[PDB]
Design an enzyme around this catalytic site. Structure first.
Site, PDB file in Angstrom:
ATOM      1  N   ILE A  82       0.836  -0.882   0.034  1.00  0.00           N
ATOM      2  CA  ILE A  82       0.043   0.083  -0.081  1.00  0.00           C
ATOM      3  C   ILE A  82       0.881   1.180  -0.044  1.00  0.00           C
ATOM      4  O   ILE A  82       1.608   1.194   0.802  1.00  0.00           O
ATOM      5  CB  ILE A  82      -0.728  -0.017   1.207  1.00  0.00           C
ATOM      6  N   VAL A  83       0.781   1.965  -0.905  1.00  0.00           N
ATOM      7  CA  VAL A  83       1.615   3.246  -1.196  1.00  0.00           C
ATOM      8  C   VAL A  83       0.965   4.506  -0.769  1.00  0.00           C
ATOM      9  O   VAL A  83      -0.288   4.718  -1.462  1.00  0.00           O
ATOM     10  CB  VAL A  83       2.213   3.211  -2.357  1.00  0.00           C
ATOM     11  N   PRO A  84       1.162   5.547  -0.052  1.00  0.00           N
ATOM     12  CA  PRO A  84       0.420   6.523   0.154  1.00  0.00           C
ATOM     13  C   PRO A  84       0.577   7.686  -0.752  1.00  0.00           C
ATOM     14  O   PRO A  84       1.525   7.893  -1.671  1.00  0.00           O
ATOM     15  CB  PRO A  84       1.005   7.106   1.653  1.00  0.00           C
ATOM     16  N   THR A  85      -0.182   8.755  -0.679  1.00  0.00           N
ATOM     17  CA  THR A  85      -0.182  10.043  -1.492  1.00  0.00           C
ATOM     18  C   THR A  85       1.088  10.787  -1.072  1.00  0.00           C
ATOM     19  O   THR A  85       1.642  11.337  -1.755  1.00  0.00           O
ATOM     20  CB  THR A  85      -1.240  11.057  -0.989  1.00  0.00           C
ATOM     21  N   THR A  86       1.679  10.556   0.029  1.00  0.00           N
ATOM     22  CA  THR A  86       2.722  11.367   0.616  1.00  0.00           C
ATOM     23  C   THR A  86       4.089  10.935   0.145  1.00  0.00           C
ATOM     24  O   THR A  86       5.071  11.966  -0.066  1.00  0.00           O
ATOM     25  CB  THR A  86       2.678  11.346   2.262  1.00  0.00           C
ATOM     26  N   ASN A  87       4.496   9.786  -0.380  1.00  0.00           N
ATOM     27  CA  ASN A  87       5.838   9.526  -0.563  1.00  0.00           C
ATOM     28  C   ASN A  87       5.666   8.514  -1.805  1.00  0.00           C
ATOM     29  O   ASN A  87       6.195   7.372  -1.608  1.00  0.00           O
ATOM     30  CB  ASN A  87       6.622   8.957   0.584  1.00  0.00           C
ATOM     31  N   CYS A 113       7.435  10.835   8.219  1.00  0.00           N
ATOM     32  CA  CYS A 113       6.559  10.220   9.275  1.00  0.00           C
ATOM     33  C   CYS A 113       6.902  10.446  10.400  1.00  0.00           C
ATOM     34  O   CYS A 113       5.972  10.123  11.418  1.00  0.00           O
ATOM     35  CB  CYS A 113       6.649   8.680   8.644  1.00  0.00           C
ATOM     36  N   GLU A 123      -1.523  15.012  14.068  1.00  0.00           N
ATOM     37  CA  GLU A 123      -0.380  14.890  13.130  1.00  0.00           C
ATOM     38  C   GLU A 123      -0.845  15.795  11.765  1.00  0.00           C
ATOM     39  O   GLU A 123      -1.968  15.407  11.216  1.00  0.00           O
ATOM     40  CB  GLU A 123      -0.289  13.294  12.640  1.00  0.00           C
TER      41      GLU A 123
HETATM   42 CL    CL Z   1       8.255  10.812  -3.110  1.00  0.00          CL
END
Ligand code: CL
Ligand code: CL
Lengths: 409, 411
Positions: A106-111, A238, A326
């Site tokens: 699962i990959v986030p919007t953030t990185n 993070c 956060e």
């Molecule tokens: Cl990135």
């Protein structure tokens, strides 16, 4: 879609089965080739990531990408992940490695790109398959990160479909990939909750980090320290400090110092205009935005050269205070404490926001407050406890293999 | 008195406070509680065994006596000197908080003993959620450990339990904000329910044995049966089937009669299957029952002295054959393989049927067949792989019941 998900999964299954039988030499050649190619694409991918997501800083995302590639390559170039890891011929025992199979990432919007490169390279090194479940908001960044690494992998000999991805992400397909029988592990970087509620072995990768500055601290150091992270990739990282909890006697001195770091302390009224923009659940539109644009989303006039917004809490640390949460942005809460123990108590509460017990920090006179440090250590339920140190001062290959022990008569 | 929601919540809060107080205890105080509670649990070896068999209607009293011993005295000697509190930049061990122990009917007293002991050793609080068919012996083993910990100075509410277990409360205990960890043993369902709880969870598999043509058959047969009657085959990770290469199949089958293992006729085997699984699941009423009783409930005639039922597969290992499943009883499937690789292949399916692969065994000539050993090693998705040795992760221990914390100072 639901159907074509299955066909893609069964492809990587068989591709993994072919990959499992590979020699360490072919694994090494692929690993280097996949890592060298990701590093050589540090800039294009960072650039693509910034433009699609609409957040962060190219030059910092370039650094992120270089860490996820060359740095991962140099750490695990020589780590044994296949075959006999230990023998004791006297006991008639041995430990044998076994790839876990197919990973669900699962990959986030953030990185979007750095996490895809990282997980791809460590899957390849361990003879795993991996399937990426990108966030809608940065689908192409991560899938093109995955693709670049795939293609470099395939060209040094890797099976056709050793990595895949969901091209058009959904809640249906994310949950389909997760609970699927031939997916063996979840690498998940809230969304953490979904992974742990799926019946699968899961590793969850954020959390809420409080900082206590007590009366004995070096104010100038604590203040610069705590601020180091907030501007890197527009505070998209993070492990980072979310609020400062400051002992009364030293409060005003902390507040005044902020200004020499371009940290703008928001008036009570202007803090409430920011506080109504941070939360609605974290607001995605501020995530990874510079302080100056968050202010301009709020009602707030802030000087042009400001790097960070400081919003001080009226009352203690409270769930109702968005500055206590956060914020994934160049923002900090600031909360007042009666004393050391009170500040510790307030930190405990910030930690409970997050459920995640990740890291906490204390600034204090080390030479004379050993009791306080031990006290702080006994009362924080966070895996990492930092004394006079910022968070900018760990999933690996070993997590993606099984050790099987063999005992002979 | 915990029979409903306001009572579960109210009890959880008492354990919460107990653990708060217990967290403060010294290693000396812990040691004293740990010795005292283990010694009491051991001394209740027999009455707790008898209680367990009587209430759940399964197993063998003097085999459960041994289980209660190993959950008490042995656990004590293993961990008497293990550090669990304090210092280990620096590393501080800390209790996880309140544990949720899920206790099955198969081992109601030994697992409540074990879990209570290592929980006490770690300054945690633990609350048990027993199965209704063994709720008294579970909760009373718990009480006995509690009372002896308390008398040795442990805080009052440090061990708790649900007096009238039910789905809603079991589900609620696992899901409760104030539970740090779920220690879940028993059925595939429950274990998976602990994995889907959205909480840290440890679960405590279906064991295939291959016997190829090169094996020592006398020895293979003997070793494979050793586990089978212990507490009527309620034994973690004991052999469930032999997969035998065709060349030595009749030999193996012949040796079974020598060991009180009755080979069921094709007709009888069919009768026993229908009693082994019900609604796709292991039938509760055969678990921990002797071979003769399982023969009786199936309506099958078997000599009075028979120790183990053998059900032959018609063809190969398959999901559809109850003898390919974990049976928790003195019963074993027997399956024909064309050759060694075909055997390994049928074993692979048995590991799949079991869910999580945990242990498997091969009997061969290990002083000639190194390639086969390595080959079996590669294909078997199991933590433990045994060559020429009976079954008679790692084990759960205090290690697992603490969080480690790193403190980092600034030079
Ligand atoms: Cl990135
Ligand atoms: Cl027992």
């Amino acid at each position: 879609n639901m159907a074509e998900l299955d066909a893609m999964i069964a492809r990587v299954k068989k591709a993994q089965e072919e990959f499992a039988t590979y020699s360490q030499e072919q694994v090494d050649k692929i690993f280097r080739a996949a890592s060298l190619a990701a590093n050589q694409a540090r800039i294009p991918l960072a650039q693509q990531a910034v433009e699609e997501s609409g957040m962060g800083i190219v030059e910092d995302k370039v650094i992120k990408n270089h860490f996820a590639s060359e740095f991962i390559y140099n750490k695990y170039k020589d780590e044994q992940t296949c075959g006999i890891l230990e023998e004791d011929d006297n006991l008639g025992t041995m430990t044998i490695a076994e790839p876990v199979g197919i990973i669900c990432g699962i990959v986030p919007t953030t990185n979007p790109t750095s996490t895809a490169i990282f997980k791809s390279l460590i899957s390849l090194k361990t003879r795993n398959g991996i399937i990426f479940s990108p966030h809608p908001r940065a689908k192409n960044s991560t899938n093109d990160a995955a693709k670049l690494v795939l293609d470099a992998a395939v060209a040094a000999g890797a099976p056709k479909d050793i990595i895949g991805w969901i091209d058009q992400p959904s809640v249906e397909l994310s949950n389909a990939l997760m609970k699927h029988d031939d997916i063996a592990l979840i690498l998940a970087t809230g969304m953490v909750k979904a992974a742990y509620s799926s019946g699968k072995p899961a590793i969850g990768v954020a959390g809420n980090v409080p900082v206590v500055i007590d009366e004995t601290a070096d104010i100038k150091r604590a203040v610069a320290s705590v601020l180091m992270s907030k501007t890197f990739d527009n505070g998209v990282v993070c492990a980072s400090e979310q609020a400062v909890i400051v002992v009364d006697e030293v409060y005003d001195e902390v507040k005044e110092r902020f200004a020499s770091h371009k940290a703008h302390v928001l008036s009570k009224t202007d803090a409430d205009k920011v506080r109504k923009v941070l939360l609605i659940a974290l607001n995605a539109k501020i995530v990874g935005q510079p302080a100056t644009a968050i202010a301009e989303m709020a009602g707030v006039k802030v000087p042009a050269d400001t790097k960070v917004l400081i919003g001080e809490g009226l009352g203690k640390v409270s769930y109702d205070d968005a500055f206590a949460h956060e914020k994934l942005s160049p923002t900090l809460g600031m909360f007042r404490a009666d004393n050391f123990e009170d500040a510790v108590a307030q930190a405990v509460t910030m930690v409970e926001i997050g459920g995640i017990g990740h890291t906490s920090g204390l600034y204090t006179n080390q030479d004379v407050n050993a009791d306080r440090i031990r006290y702080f250590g006994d009362k924080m339920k966070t895996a990492r406890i930092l004394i006079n140190i910022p968070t900018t001062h760990n999933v690996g290959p070993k997590h993606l293999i099984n050790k099987k022990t063999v005992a002979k008569r």
